[PDB]
Curated annotation (Swiss-Prot):
Effect annotated for changing residue 29 to V: Abolishes dependence to reducing agents
UniProt remark on domains: The KA1 domain mediates binding to phospholipids and targeting to membranes.
Name under which the protein is recorded: Maternal embryonic leucine zipper kinase
Binding site for ATP: 17-25, 40
Record-listed Phosphoserine modification sites: 152, 234
Modified residues (Phosphothreonine): 56
Subunit structure comment from the entry: Monomer. Interacts with ZNF622 and PPP1R8.
Gene Ontology biological-process entries: apoptotic process; cell population proliferation; G2/M transition of mitotic cell cycle; hemopoiesis; intrinsic apoptotic signaling pathway in response to oxidative stress; neural precursor cell proliferation; positive regulation of apoptotic process; protein autophosphorylation
Residues of the full protein shown: 2 to 333 of 651
Active site, renumbered: 132
Stated family: Belongs to the protein kinase superfamily. CAMK Ser/Thr protein kinase family. SNF1 subfamily.
Keywords: Apoptosis, ATP-binding, Calcium, Cell cycle, Cell membrane, Kinase, Lipid-binding, Membrane, Nucleotide-binding, Phosphoprotein, Serine/threonine-protein kinase, Transferase
Organism whose genome encodes this protein: Homo sapiens
Length: 312
């Protein structure tokens, strides 16, 4: 209805995949590269008074450039809509994975968990928090690598639950502790059939420790699942934790391996736009999160996954 016209120059829309909170999520294809993307759609009239909060939050997400975070490619604002185009993760949720395998071994949990820690550390290093860590918000890519999305009650920290002020970073550590327990046990540490009983169990902080957990596992859970947020392990101490280090002998590399422009991607854009190299480089370097940014980031992802850097 005219809000979709600009978008439909660049993307072919596939199926809705998520009628989430404030935003519809559609699957789509970027025409020029033929790459699948996820498109978050919001209506500006129903955001109303929140429209500035969101526009500002969108600017924070532009800086989230990290191998274990789903990347933002394109922001398009029309008269009535905001469209956000995001990195597609075909592998589905970690939630699905844990159900299929029942529970992960300590060794496999460790591989999974270092990736989460990696991304969460990066987020906190930029002065942000995720605030909603759970297996539904962690996706696998085609190489079985984890990507964080969506910047529930079972994973929420005691202070958050009481409606007190809370530090995002501290709440993220509690939530990762619940994630850790779920990965290794195959079930929640705190569960109940009504909200009040659940809230109470979370506040009391007592949970069962299954007899298959290693002493090292038990200890790391005890450092993360501390009802008093002050008593919780710091990010610093988590990246170099003994359990984290087991079978690896180096700490979690959390800093972004993502950049300087990639010469193959620039070449292919210069060819397509019939430009000099230096002209394309200047234009890409504006980083407007327009169609050019989108195409560039999608070629950079074809490269990163070994594919050829080509436009149609
Ligand atoms: C900038 C920081 N990042 C963000 O804020 C973000 C994000 C975000 C959110 C969601 C997705 C994403 C990125 N990429 C994706 O591929 C997403 C979805 N993929 C997805 C859906 C269905 C199947 C199942 N198929 C078989 C239909 C697979 C895959 C997805 C959509 C809705 C719910 C769960 C996942």
């Amino acid at each position: 209805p005219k809000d979709y016209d600009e978008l439909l120059k660049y993307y072919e829309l596939h199926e809705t995949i998520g009628t989430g909170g404030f935003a519809k999520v559609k699957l789509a294809c970027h025409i020029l590269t033929g790459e699948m993307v996820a498109i978050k759609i919001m209506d500006k009239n129903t955001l109303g008074s929140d429209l500035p909060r969101i526009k500002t939050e969108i600017e924070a997400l532009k800086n989230l450039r990290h191998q274990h975070i789903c990347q933002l490619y394109h922001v398009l604002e029309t008269a009535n809509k905001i469209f956000m185009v995001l990195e597609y993760c075909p592998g589905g949720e970690l939630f699905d994975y844990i159900i299929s395998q029942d529970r992960l071994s300590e060794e496999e949990t460790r591989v999974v968990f270092r990736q989460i820690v990696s991304a969460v550390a990066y987020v906190h290093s930029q002065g942000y928090a995720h605030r909603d860590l759970k297996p539904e918000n962690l996706l696998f890519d085609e190489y079985h690598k984890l990507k964080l999305i969506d910047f529930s009650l079972a994973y929420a920290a005691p202070e958050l639950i009481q409606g007190k002020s809370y530090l995002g970073s501290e709440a993220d550590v509690w939530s990762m502790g619940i994630l850790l327990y779920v990965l290794m046990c195959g079930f929640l540490p705190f569960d109940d059939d009504n909200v009040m009983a659940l809230y109470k169990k979370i506040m009391r902080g007592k949970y069962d420790v299954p007899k298959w957990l290693s002493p090292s596992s038990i200890l790391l859970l005890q450092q993360m699942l501390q009802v008093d947020p002050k008593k919780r392990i710091s990010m610093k101490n988590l990246l170099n934790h003994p359990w984290i280090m087991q079978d690896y002998n180096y700490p979690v590399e959390w800093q972004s391996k993502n950049p300087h422009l990639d010469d193959d991607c620039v070449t292919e854009l210069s060819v397509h736009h019939r430009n000099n190299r230096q002209t394309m480089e200047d234009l890409i370097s504006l980083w407007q999160y327009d169609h050019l940014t989108a195409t560039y980031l999608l070629l950079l992802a074809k490269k990163a996954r070994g594919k050829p850097v080509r436009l149609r």
